[model samples]
Target: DFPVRRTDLGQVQGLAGDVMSFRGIPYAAPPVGGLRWKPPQHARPWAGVRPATQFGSDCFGAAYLRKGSLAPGVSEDCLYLNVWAPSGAKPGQYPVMVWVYGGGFAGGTAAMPYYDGEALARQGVVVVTFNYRTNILGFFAHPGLSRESPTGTSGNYGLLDILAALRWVQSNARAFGGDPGRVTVFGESAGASAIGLLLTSPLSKGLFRGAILESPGLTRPLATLADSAASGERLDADLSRLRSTDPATLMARADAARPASRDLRRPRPTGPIVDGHVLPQTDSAAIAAGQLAPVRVLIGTNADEGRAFLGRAPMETPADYQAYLEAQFGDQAAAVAACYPLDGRATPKEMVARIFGDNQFNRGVSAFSEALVRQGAPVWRYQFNGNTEGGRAPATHGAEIPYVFGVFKLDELGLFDWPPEGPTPADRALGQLMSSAWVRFAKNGDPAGDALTWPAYSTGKSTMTFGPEGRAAVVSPGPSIPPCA
Candidate 1:
């Protein structure tokens, strides 16, 4: 009785602990074989209880950094999700938090240890972690595929998977002590970007009550359905041959066929498209028209998001900086350059890193904030400067994740390396504060709590700054950048 719950599909046996855990529960049928490049289907019901004690296969991703740790193994049959709920909670007593991992829309997994729901579940809420397909396997589009669709569109199977999972949550959240009306979606990087898409998607309407987007990449300037379909046919347009191709070969060919670009800042031709159905318009346009889902939003970016991406391009002198502006912004390069002049403000490389980071991640934060604020939605924003007090390093991309999950040992990109003495006491405290704030937001729409009171974004363009001095305070969002169209 303690670890058994009956879902819409059937009964499941979970594990007992301070919090109960149900792992590897399928939300949709396996998208394999003939189902390739197709929308997700409903998971079939079983007669008796099915074992749900371990993780299911992580969805296939060609560039997952910790592929070895994906011991459940990568497969097309990875639509499974895991749930963590408090031990003694009654049905529908807790808020629900669904996590989506980020990897440039190319790779990531929900099975990673850092994403474990135990810690968050213990804080009196139900936490959900699930797999969504990525890379060519998840986002492939074609003319044949488009014509076969009822929506007259293809690609964004990954977004469809998310929609299916949310629908499953609505039908099953109460079974795990989670309120269907209180579900909040949160994710980082590409995953956060997916939530941004979900905010604007017509199909995802009413699925989530609130959203927390960390880094919020891929928020705008998306590829159109027509362009994405063309890219999928670059190597060959035959869906019959492509569908039957081996998974590994398909992955390799997709990578090779990706459009070559001299302008490094242009988003790759993958991930969500401005499809006529799933997404009728761009996120900005939807938000501008107040057509987005009615939900509170808490979004932020790190102080130096570009440092992580700087290695991708050459940025040495003033000429390199000018070239980057030209390549990324075209005829508007002069206006864009005016926002980031290197007049004793920063070095050549530093300016390039700043511009790249601003274009890729920070601008999205600004755009989303402005859009939501103008529409009079309840929104809060922040800038993660660094993790610890007295730390010399800037808070680069994803530096704030471990703190958010409250799992410091988990390192996917070798970004956070502890010294022999171990993580500082200040670091530990910051992690506690951030995670507590996040969980507080899940409990309600607002992230303010006893530890800190975060101000709303409408208050003088304010931001909750998690500074390098091991403290958070309301401050002005420094150095605005011109919108790079």
Candidate 2:
């Protein structure tokens, strides 16, 4: 047999890799033309076996803003998903793991080689990854679009794409030997932020049994619906004209609307909006009220997320750091500044990095985890300090991905530059342990097995720390940085 699988929409054939690989499976109708700015719709059915050996496209956005070039595959008709299943596995033989790629909600693609599901599938679980709209096409909110909406709101189409893909997985996982009831969703950075929002969304309840949020980006406050719509209104184009605009022009306009600024004060809001229909409440409000999805969660942050983002605002001098704290913290600046003392030895940039990283990543993680425990959700937290960069710096953001997917070599995205000698034995061993722990979590509910004893987050703040040489240990962690709440 040619590894043919029947989906709800059609019969399809995928290539045989270490596992059966199904690529470019349409999970929803292409959100193009009239469907622009609307929620995802069902994919049309087909008669004959459709070829699924090629990926469709990365959703249209300003890749140049982040990666300085367009990702190879870019288009508006990008509502496609992929799956990798163990060869010859019977129906419902394994748990399912779905991936959501991170690009700060501007650019990212599942087609990147580092994210291939083969190795993860080899661990006796079916793997799924998909593309979703981003940038203006994904999140632009306008009064005209809102007027035309059934829910009288707009923005968050990217989130709608995720829900659509998960619904499709629920409907079709059995055909690929995946257990729908055991599905787990995992992502990094912006993707993790999306999952955090999904946890608070009533529409996403029961879609996944568990989630893995690596370096959750919960620091930035969401754009209010009016603020997001005001940005769209500033484009000076009618809704009809906006939809007809070329993708390149729209991408450039989106980039211009929120230009990357070095100034930390008054940062622009570009990602998801707190639309009443989909989000219903702010993330903090939902967490405080215990109004979140009932699911197990594996959440953590890297040791140095600040370094990854330091280039945007280097804060090279004491004056720059002092002014930033004064502007951003106001009355609380002194307390915050006291924690990160401006000692003579430590450079101002070093202090800035610690403060930024704590604010952007660690503090939110601590608060979210504490709330999860209070709400009676099973939680396992970690700190990824694995020295992937050869002691050049502590583990920056997005460093845990290769370990989680078990793909060491750099892909086309080129996010991480490996050491000249390539992956050390320590790197390979660490990759195995991390990926295995993720698979174990998906297979059951707990990440711990015989090899690892990961404790749940409690008032004591028990955290699993992955050290420089891939060793695992339980460390009673305080904050990500000293003097951070």
Candidate 3:
């Protein structure tokens, strides 16, 4: 019912409307100059229309060269959000879904082409995506920064940005036809990790009604001063030298010092912390004590979630793979191998994928699900097993996003050379089923719909599998014990 509008910030134009769009809406005061290394503060309301024509500059830090450099507008003052909602809703409230992009808490943007929310917005939901500080800008913590805080805490600036965005939605979402009461925060990888952390965060309670955590990184223990000290020492040295240097020069030095391994390039000194104010304790302990919001949850993992990394560096042989597992499991190495067998029949690469996938993702799904079930809150668990035809990797990490969003044909996400005729009838059915379940969960406290009678997760070990056919109950298949330190 509303028409598109353009607003100006100084001279730059920001465009906001229905349908596909890119807008630079502020959630917090720009984190620049004196505001550096501090928790975000409220953005002052503007007197006139603000132009959101383009995304604000992305957060500063190490670049993900493997995924490619930041888009043109990335910068330090990058606390902006983008929105995509269906053109005309009948003036009624629609379910809202906010996306937190993932790059290991180091580098990522809301501008990535794959994250376009147009398709999902068309499915009767309002979609919001935004940038958070990555790498050093988002995660770095040190004695100086910590000393400035009233609580003597620092780090998790990115998570604070997320909370700020939700506050923006609570105040301003109704202007765009979104139901503020029915908000769902969904993400993958580190984004998923953020969701897991939020589940136990006192600062995030009541901000979102439901959560969809796809492959959450539940391994990182809460950030402590000791942990921060080690990471801080490295960052303190770098920043001390580069404090006055330009963003580009600092980025180059970071690149040179980064290890050759693609994974190492994404390290950040900051991560979620168990700060007494924001996060009371580690997420695992908080969940165990039922000190979390009793919201509905949709948690799932890809069948071959670790294939993306495993395929990049194949293990030399079964013995080498066993040694790697031994290093990870320590005294439990033999038990770990028993659950994830490496009988030499499977290729070394396949075994690596199996072991790492279970360690990093699958077991976490089970642990989180079990925790939610113990609380008597509704929780649904899923495993995505739809592999790309003829591809060496099975349904690897992030394979379900395009399918769930119903945008499999856009650019590089065309399902590994599958037909461009778009998603098969089966694919469309799955999209409708999954999206409906998510939307239903957001609107109410349950995900039940016409698609399938998905049962809630329980100590009895129930799970649902999403594959070529449809959803069905299945017994938990991964190891019962925690897979990593």
Candidate 4:
């Protein structure tokens, strides 16, 4: 008798957990049968007041959360979303923040514990998280599929799913106490890449007002329509061939068809693709060419971003490091070495981390922010270097996730020691700091307003540093960390 509300499609009843949470709300009808390979369609109206107390199944889920004990499972009927708002928030009161999780585009579910938005919601915001199709079920491009008409395109079904969700948010935000005009799309890694793609997708124009990207896979190559079709060919299959095929089989074939390269320079066809429709161009090219949605932006990466990925580089000797560098960088090895020296008391693994971080994330961050700057968009840049655990993961890879979501460290969760370790008072403070900044950005599209004095990214490199011991410093980015052209 306490919580019931009329929404656009039907009546829904949500539950309370600290903040008010509405879960298992279908944003779109299940993409099954003939609808399987197509873009998401509007959800059907339910007759009774639907109970949204529990969560829906995640699209192709579970494998991402190796810790099966966590409350999560996989299902194709996963085109649902959840919301967290202030316990007593009224309609049209709060800004909206939509989260897209990262799992290399092959994994990830919105049901993960660490992704909870209650902490941020308690800060006077409406938070949304939804699952999208991944792996082959979400990102395949077949000739017959392309010829199926509409946009004359295939692949990027996941991206289409995201567009559908955003549309739902726009249509129903006010009913959930959210401001449709102030929506911010945010995420990390592949999620960040999705944000990047959203920024570039023509269909997403004016759909969001702000963006936050944490260690976005900006450096990763987005597949071209040609690249995607070639990958489909690699599977030696078309729409019908892929359809009747077991989803797991198609997933394996899709993963095998895409890039799994040891060499970072090699572009892969696995991630988002520019099918010349949903994606008019590559996200990078779109940003570089100033085709973005003209929204405020918050983008950053970690200090030792490579450690999580490369984990203890095998080379222990200088010769091996030099050889690895030479093979990877060729004539530029010495130049890179001159900038990132191995002469320190540092070990070989440390040097390798530096090299990988610079190329993979640091340089890409530079290009990303600078392109926004070039396009004259307001952007804020950050670098997290807190070595001590700020959520179990070093200030590396996705170490910032827990803090960004204002949760305990990721590894603090039982059996999920991936981020590895624990949070100190300083770590907790940093979490508070980042969370405050993120919410502040969500509210006004400017992160610095009375929080930490973050400046807009311009021609010069002015970056904020979230260092060890809850430190927040306004400093110039390393001049040595070249434009990475």
Tell me how far the alpha carbon of residue 69 in candidate 2 is from the true structure, in angstroms, after superposition: 10
Model 1 ranges with Cα > 4 A deviation: 259-265, 312-337, 417-421, 476-479, 482-485
Find the candidate with the highest lDDT and give its number: 2
The 10-residue segment of model 1 with minimum total lDDT is: 62-71
* Model 3, span 399-467: residue lDDT tens: 777666666644332232234565556666666777677667767766667656666766356566676
Deviation (Å) of 158 in candidate 1: 0.5
Better of 1 and 4 by lDDT: 1
Clash total of candidate 3: 12
- Per-residue C-alpha lDDT of model 1 across residues 327-380, encoded as one tens digit per residue: 777998798778788787887677776877777777777878888887788888
Q: Which pairs clash inside model 4?
A: 391-409, 392-419
lDDT of candidate 3? 0.69
Candidate 2 or 4, higher lDDT? Answer: 2
TM-score for each of the candidates: 0.93, 0.94, 0.86, 0.90
The per-model lDDT (C-alpha) reads 0.81, 0.82, 0.69, 0.77
Any idea what lDDT model 1 has? 0.81
Question: Over the stretch 1-485, how does candidate 4's per-residue lDDT look in tens digits?
Answer: 24566679998999865588888889998987677779899888988899888888778732644243233556777898999888667778999999988877777778777878899999889999998887777877777778885988888889888888999999998988899999999988888878877777778887889999998877466677776777676676556656667666656655554533356676544557878888887766776677876679998888777776653346788988898788888998898777767886677777777677776677667777877787778888888877444354446777788878876745432322233456567767878888989999999888885758777767257787887777777776532364333
- lDDT, ranked from best to worst: 2, 1, 4, 3
TM-score of 1: 0.93
TM-score of 3: 0.86
